[PDB]
């Protein structure tokens, strides 16, 4: 490789190292399951149930 | 049995044993710290549940690898297969055996020094070759051949990168190398020596981006793939102990060793060593992995001429100011 | 001197305890944990001349490296004459390296 | 939105950067979707809209009948052949449906782009190294579910 | 209640040997190295659990070995295709003791929606499964919940401390079903959020 | 100092004996590496510190790495010559063993009549060796560079793949 290519490559390596270190200075984006409960939107498709009418009888 | 010479003999032996135990535990807890610092670099936490802050994660890994079933392949050659992790551990451990961590705290004040380090590096490439061949896996054999050719391509200039520091000190002794850095640390005059030694030290430790079992995973050609239990653990802990040894050698050869203005000398040595260990982690986190031919061509075409030119220029400078 | 013999004893104990430590971890790994059998557990999971060429280049340049190792520890008392001799040595080295690179000996890629 | 195009040569790198520009264009489309979302129905007013709107199903008998037959026996598609081609994430994806007048497809043919890209692999990687092959596989943007269906 | 693999037996558990068994179980359950094996979309959710937003490394289970010899856990995350079933069996046979299996997703559980000519109807037709995860795909925290369930199962199993001394049988605890454990809290649910909001 | 000398010499002799009679090439190279390590220990016991360092760095760290590399490349397994164990048959080795024993007896008899004040083991450093190498032995250094260049050119010409 050329000298200019080597110097530019070293500069890009330095930039990558610097950006990942600044990432180490950043805020964690981890959702701490299970101590922090998973937020689920109201129409989330998980466990199936059978429900009751307002009178208390089963709707099925 | 009451004599100052005998008391000094057991004092020196106890200091050597303390250095050995601290280095081995530092390598294992640096496997743990590798996990935690990669978590820090990637906006996460890493292992922080097994003990306080994950501090017992290493103990859990050690128990798991001890009580994992011991396995040797039936078609493998048992002696060489067993022997390869032993060399991968002991080579860079005995390379640490020359590092002066404090004034008066050294295991072996040898007249050869970094020559002993070069001896240990050659035995380390033996560990990689033996692990590849003894597994009776042709993929592991091919991967170990590539890893060994890479390691030779960088060990060809490792010592030459150290020769500028040796020339400035006028000695192979490590304490004389430290004492020659009393005014200016060697990273300023031997800057190209420092960068070539750092690249070669990463390469001979098979660290990223020179890690063959992680470089090519689609071929399944890693030379670790038949190792399990405590032999794979020996490979892991030996790799981390090698990182610790390379960091300590870089500190003592290019960053004044234990020398510092205010703090105690061991505190300065430990701080500089921990900084270079952390820089190993950041190198693993940040840089991508070049191609195999590109890596070996970089070692042969760029770094080795740079070490030769650096040695010649260092000699010219030394003889120029020798009035 | 008792300092050098104390350091020799410390070095010997260092090597012995390091070798015995890795031996002890291997023995403990072999001894502990149950063993199980499987049918395919025993089942495992021509290289070019460039490998030999690279290893051979490493050997030759390592010998020239030993010559420069011997030079570098005694540069001051070899003077400028030793500098001229080592410069001739290094020039022959770099000419050999240029020759190897230019003829494709160090080109893994086609 | 714009369609990013290359200079004439398709490497791993040019494919990856083209997908980066495609991501930026998709962000522009999403901004337009956020700013101008029309008011109206989320289901068509067609008798074959499956299922019908749920509130009318729950209180109107003809809608309940339509829902009952659509979810159980199935909607009756009159006998025809239809085709739809879209720009999927990994290339052009198409459905070719043949209906024989029943509540099930007589033939569902799914053209996926990853099948074609994996077939192109030997012509593009010939004369290269294995490292070039794994980088090429990383730059193709395929999944094996797309290839094998 | 325990099941023995060499039958339904009782607990075989000196007080020092119990402490050693607890220490070995603690070390095994806190160091679980999964095998990097991807079958289908469920594997995408598994490696999503490996990333920063979930950080499965916190449980000490991120190492993700490419060799079955270094792996303690096989996650069948995806469909057991008929062509891939010998591959799965060979990779499981190449794993070393102790080894655990998590079947992840409806395909690995039972064949899922793919009751089709080219799909084996569940990975438990030919290899034993320690933990099942329903879902298509299970979300990454469901994989983490199954990891914790596997940790609870490991923490009370009985395995030989050495292969030269003592009983060599593997005892697995007959744990209470999660359905029956959670039935009390699940049936008591009355109202949920209406699906018209965010 | 003599304890190390005699034990390292015995280890080197025994390892060489295992080398010249072994069947597996990788095992033979491992015993050769062990003998070179023992010879380096002999060098360190005599005060030749640079020689021992180069014995492990170059002989047991480069040349035998090349031998091991070639063996691993050749995939030497169940070779027909390897399986025969012709060198283990008495009628093959009894002649050369007698010849080597006679040569050893003559050389040892010549050795035992030389003047011997003993080796003090005073360490001759790498610095003095470097001074001698670039002083009186300058032509040796430059023509050794030429010799290794010749080895490089020959081995590239012969060991090419083409
Ligand atoms: C404690 C340990 C760490 C200490 C920190 C300092 C040392 C870091 C050591 C890292 C070692 C990594 C070595 C990587 C060498 C890669 C060389 C290579 O092959 O690069 C290939 C690339 C392109 O090559 P080319 O042939 O032109 O390709 C054209 C074909 N399309 O060519 C290029 O991209 C050209 C440039 C290549 C890289 C130049 C060297 C970079 C070294 C890493 C950055 C270090 C920065 C300082 C860090 C902080 C120090 C305190
Ligand atoms: C003692 C402890 C501390 C040790 C410190 C070690 C590091 C060296 C000293 C600091 C160097 C600072 C470098 C600053 C780089 C800035 C980042 C950057 O912008 O880099 C990229 C830039 C090229 O930009 P562009 O072309 O747009 O790239 C994107 C397309 N690829 O790239 C450039 O413009 C390149 C600019 C020049 C970079 C090199 C500067 C001189 C280096 C001299 C020493 C040689 C280093 C390499 C030797 C390798 C030999 C094997
Ligand atoms: C003061 C000494 C400076 C260094 C001189 C020696 C450097 C050796 C590095 C090397 O291996 O260089 C190989 C290089 C090959 O160059 P080439 O393949 O022709 O490139 C064409 C497009 N760049 O070849 C070169 O870069 C040529 C370098 C000069 C060759 C003549 C002098 C040799 C001594
Ligand atoms: C599985 C086991 C395989 C075999 C492993 C090794 C077996 C032997 C282990 C026991 C060793 C006992 C101790 C040896 C002596 C230590 C002290 C010593 O070497 O002192 C001599 C000399 C002193 O030099 P200095 O301090 O400068 O004094 C100047 C004037 N007095 O200092 C010197 O001369 C220093 C240079 C010599 C240091 C040699 C260190 C060991 C080298 C072999 C490493 C083997 C690595 C593992 C196996 C590799 C593959 C086979
Ligand atoms: C224990 C019984 C046998 C068991 C089986 C074999 C085990 C290995 C035995 C060989 C290695 C250890 C030999 C004993 C060394 C003990 C240290 C010693 O002798 O120190 C004296 C001297 C110190 O240097 P100096 O300053 O001259 O001091 C003279 C006194 N003031 O020292 C010196 O000058 C030189 C010091 C020795 C040289 C460095 C170490 C060489 C190691 C070579 C190992 C070769 C491979 C062995 C493989 C074994 C299995 C097959
Ligand atoms: C990564 C660092 C590895 C170091 C290995 C050796 C550790 C030796 C510890 C020696 C401690 C005492 C040093 C001399 C006294 C000066 C410092 C006093 C406060 C610690
Ligand atoms: C296929 C051909 C094989 C040829 C093998 C040659 C082996 C030669 C062995 C020579 C043995 C000499 C024994 C001692 C002779 C008497 C003492 C020396 C001469 C005075
Ligand atoms: S269970 Fe669903 S998400 Fe998982 S592999 Fe099967 S189809 Fe994919």
PDB file of C-alpha atoms in Angstrom, chain D residues 21-77:
ATOM      1  CA  UNK D  21     -29.099   5.115   1.272  1.00  0.00           C
ATOM      2  CA  UNK D  22     -32.244   2.977   0.976  1.00  0.00           C
ATOM      3  CA  UNK D  23     -32.562   3.202   4.770  1.00  0.00           C
ATOM      4  CA  UNK D  24     -32.334   7.001   4.564  1.00  0.00           C
ATOM      5  CA  UNK D  25     -35.004   7.085   1.841  1.00  0.00           C
ATOM      6  CA  UNK D  26     -37.251   4.851   3.950  1.00  0.00           C
ATOM      7  CA  UNK D  27     -36.818   7.328   6.809  1.00  0.00           C
ATOM      8  CA  UNK D  28     -37.997  10.071   4.427  1.00  0.00           C
ATOM      9  CA  UNK D  29     -41.054   7.976   3.485  1.00  0.00           C
ATOM     10  CA  UNK D  30     -41.769   7.385   7.183  1.00  0.00           C
ATOM     11  CA  UNK D  31     -41.594  11.136   7.818  1.00  0.00           C
ATOM     12  CA  UNK D  32     -44.155  11.675   5.057  1.00  0.00           C
ATOM     13  CA  UNK D  33     -46.341   8.907   6.533  1.00  0.00           C
ATOM     14  CA  UNK D  34     -46.184  10.574   9.954  1.00  0.00           C
ATOM     15  CA  UNK D  35     -46.977  14.046   8.624  1.00  0.00           C
ATOM     16  CA  UNK D  36     -49.813  13.065   6.242  1.00  0.00           C
ATOM     17  CA  UNK D  37     -51.814  10.133   7.568  1.00  0.00           C
ATOM     18  CA  UNK D  38     -55.289  10.257   5.991  1.00  0.00           C
ATOM     19  CA  UNK D  39     -58.480  10.092   7.994  1.00  0.00           C
ATOM     20  CA  UNK D  40     -60.781   7.272   6.986  1.00  0.00           C
ATOM     21  CA  UNK D  41     -61.388   3.540   7.240  1.00  0.00           C
ATOM     22  CA  UNK D  42     -58.757   0.913   7.919  1.00  0.00           C
ATOM     23  CA  UNK D  43     -60.820  -1.673   6.009  1.00  0.00           C
ATOM     24  CA  UNK D  44     -62.437  -1.546   2.593  1.00  0.00           C
ATOM     25  CA  UNK D  45     -66.217  -1.381   2.154  1.00  0.00           C
ATOM     26  CA  UNK D  46     -66.195  -4.577   0.018  1.00  0.00           C
ATOM     27  CA  UNK D  47     -68.175  -7.731   0.906  1.00  0.00           C
ATOM     28  CA  UNK D  48     -64.997  -9.843   0.615  1.00  0.00           C
ATOM     29  CA  UNK D  49     -63.074  -7.762   3.169  1.00  0.00           C
ATOM     30  CA  UNK D  50     -61.916 -10.476   5.557  1.00  0.00           C
ATOM     31  CA  UNK D  51     -62.838 -10.213   8.379  1.00  0.00           C
ATOM     32  CA  UNK D  52     -65.474  -7.433   8.341  1.00  0.00           C
ATOM     33  CA  UNK D  53     -65.168  -4.514  10.796  1.00  0.00           C
ATOM     34  CA  UNK D  54     -65.441  -6.012  14.253  1.00  0.00           C
ATOM     35  CA  UNK D  55     -68.011  -3.659  15.808  1.00  0.00           C
ATOM     36  CA  UNK D  56     -70.521  -4.265  13.001  1.00  0.00           C
ATOM     37  CA  UNK D  57     -69.788  -7.988  13.296  1.00  0.00           C
ATOM     38  CA  UNK D  58     -70.629  -7.772  16.996  1.00  0.00           C
ATOM     39  CA  UNK D  59     -73.956  -5.988  16.470  1.00  0.00           C
ATOM     40  CA  UNK D  60     -75.247  -6.576  12.892  1.00  0.00           C
ATOM     41  CA  UNK D  61     -76.516  -9.966  11.752  1.00  0.00           C
ATOM     42  CA  UNK D  62     -75.535  -9.773   8.060  1.00  0.00           C
ATOM     43  CA  UNK D  63     -72.037  -8.647   9.050  1.00  0.00           C
ATOM     44  CA  UNK D  64     -71.932 -11.450  11.637  1.00  0.00           C
ATOM     45  CA  UNK D  65     -72.947 -13.932   8.908  1.00  0.00           C
ATOM     46  CA  UNK D  66     -70.199 -12.659   6.605  1.00  0.00           C
ATOM     47  CA  UNK D  67     -67.664 -12.918   9.440  1.00  0.00           C
ATOM     48  CA  UNK D  68     -68.886 -16.415  10.377  1.00  0.00           C
ATOM     49  CA  UNK D  69     -68.464 -17.787   6.876  1.00  0.00           C
ATOM     50  CA  UNK D  70     -65.204 -15.912   6.224  1.00  0.00           C
ATOM     51  CA  UNK D  71     -63.366 -17.181   9.294  1.00  0.00           C
ATOM     52  CA  UNK D  72     -64.699 -20.740   9.134  1.00  0.00           C
ATOM     53  CA  UNK D  73     -65.123 -22.010   5.579  1.00  0.00           C
ATOM     54  CA  UNK D  74     -63.169 -19.108   4.112  1.00  0.00           C
ATOM     55  CA  UNK D  75     -63.836 -16.281   1.681  1.00  0.00           C
ATOM     56  CA  UNK D  76     -64.792 -17.510  -1.776  1.00  0.00           C
ATOM     57  CA  UNK D  77     -62.395 -16.096  -4.351  1.00  0.00           C
TER      58      UNK D  77
END
